[PDB]
């Protein structure tokens, strides 16, 4: 499944204040990284042609959270009074999954799965 609606490469550049760490041609997939000044880091990646998003959170380079979401056809960068966040929503007949990733001012992930 293809991610047909994604932030532009410039929008992601602003959000992560860095170009992608790496690009995989096989499945058009990108990895981005962000850190705070306390040893907390987050790896955000997605594949345009296979339709997924992944994120891993590391504290002092030890993995503490990993999430993988299949069946993404779009994700977006949104803003509220607290700052910018990556937003992704997966809607099925029975289930609604949401993820919300903030890296500024703080690294903060909010996710949910409703029936």
């Amino acid at each position: 499944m293809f991610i047909e609606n994604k932030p532009g490469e410039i929008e992601l550049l602003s959000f992560f204040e860095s170009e992608p760490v790496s690009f995989e041609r096989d499945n058009i997939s990108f990895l981005y990284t962000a850190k705070n000044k306390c040893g907390l880091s987050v790896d955000f990646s997605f594949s345009v042609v296979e339709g997924w998003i992944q994120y891993t959170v590391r504290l002092h380079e030890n993995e503490i959270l990993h999430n993988s979401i299949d069946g993404v056809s779009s994700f977006s960068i949104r803003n509220d009074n607290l700052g910018d966040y990556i937003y992704a929503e997966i809607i099925t007949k029975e289930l609604i999954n949401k993820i919300e990733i903030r890296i500024r001012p703080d690294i903060k992930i909010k996710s949910s799965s409703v029936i």
């Binding site: 058009i28 042609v49 296979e50 997924w52 992944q54 299949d70």
Partner: protein, 118 residues
């Protein structure tokens, strides 16, 4: 036989993914459990017969032009999703939703696939 696999659309590296051995990383979504369980359900063993059965099916799935359900093109290239019906040696069946890149020389490159039972 082992040349049937060589002329197929399924790269040798992709057979680790098909049998649930493509462990995940930043650029690879881990579907090892799902794919391993499905191959066992369909009766496709991680042997030479198993590889040839899959190789032939995904190669043949590119030969019909009436099973393409979605196309996508960006600056990197042209890609397509194909639906294909597969019944395995166990008698259980699934529909494979497979993603290919349509190469510049016209050939098809297997990228990934998902079984959809229901």
């Amino acid at each position: 036989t082992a040349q049937t696999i060589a002329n197929s659309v399924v790269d040798a590296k992709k057979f680790d993914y098909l049998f649930g051995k493509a462990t995940g990383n930043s650029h690879t979504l881990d579907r090892t459990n799902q794919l391993a369980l499905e191959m066992k359900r369909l009766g496709v063993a991680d042997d030479i017969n198993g590889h040839a059965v899959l190789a032939e099916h995904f190669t043949q799935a590119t030969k019909d032009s009436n099973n393409i359900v979605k196309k996508y093109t960006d600056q990197y290239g042209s890609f397509e999703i194909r639906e294909s019906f597969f019944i395995g040696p166990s008698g259980k069946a699934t529909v494979f939703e497979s993603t290919f890149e349509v190469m510049k020389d016209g050939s098809h490159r297997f990228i990934t696939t998902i079984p959809k039972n229901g």
